[PDB]
Design a protein around this ligand. Sequence first.
Ligand code: SAM
Ligand code: SF4
Ligand code: CL
Ligand code: K
Ligand code: K
Length: 245
Amino acid sequence: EVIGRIHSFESCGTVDGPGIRFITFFQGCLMRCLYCHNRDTWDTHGGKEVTVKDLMKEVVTYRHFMNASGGGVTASGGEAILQAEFVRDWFRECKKEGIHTCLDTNGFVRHYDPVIDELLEVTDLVMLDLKQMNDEIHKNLVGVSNHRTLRFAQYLAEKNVKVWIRYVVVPGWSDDDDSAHRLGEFTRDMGNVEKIELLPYHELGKHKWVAMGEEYKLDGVEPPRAETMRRVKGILEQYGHKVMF
Ligand SMILES: C[S@@+](CC[C@H](N)C(=O)[O-])C[C@H]1O[C@@H](n2cnc3c(N)ncnc32)[C@H](O)[C@@H]1O
Ligand code: SF4
Ligand SMILES: [Cl-]
Ligand SMILES: [K+]
Ligand SMILES: [K+]
């Protein structure tokens, strides 16, 4: 049995529609986003050990609120794809229960072993972050190059996996016109992308950096103005996808 390492899990209403999402926050991430609102999910050796059986006992207590009309499970974190074998196993069991599955990922896939395709076969929706198309900025914002994530986005397109692209809009970092055009260009031909969703930067989770004795590097940065969200949305819309925030 594969052992999973989790930060926590929670049931919460879906953003829209009926039903609930049971979200497991996986422990461990290898990106370093300056904005991360879950800074305590980074350590790969932390969290709580769980089995798929353990986690399904929690999931099924919400069965009546997860249906085709809305609701399901989400693998988030942290970075769930670092535990691809466990998430594959979990989603396989969710499918046996008829539950919709969603992978919330940074796409930082460094090895293409068989487990990736197996996980995707039992994933109904991938919410992929594309954090910055400009790799010079991406390296300063996230600590790593965007190359692997971009290749994974192309892989998902090749496999026709249903995808929502998520773009966190941070003043001074990801609110500029050029970066928005680059994102529009890159995703234009990906017919598997149902929508691009802009997430406005928020300062929530600062306290988690302070607990760890680490400075929060976006002190003083405010959320983007509505005008900025509308401008980025308009730029992206020129490339043909549905765009929302
Ligand atoms: C905590 S991440 C976990 C999943 C995966 N590691 C990722 O980054 O996509 C879930 C979502 O929250 C976003 N997010 C993280 N910190 C944020 C912040 N300060 N403001 C707005 N969105 C943020 C991420 O970019 C991502 O879309
Ligand atoms: S990739 Fe996701 S969990 Fe990891 S540091 Fe960035 S926002 Fe946080
Ligand atoms: Cl990672
Ligand atoms: K934060
Ligand atoms: K994501």
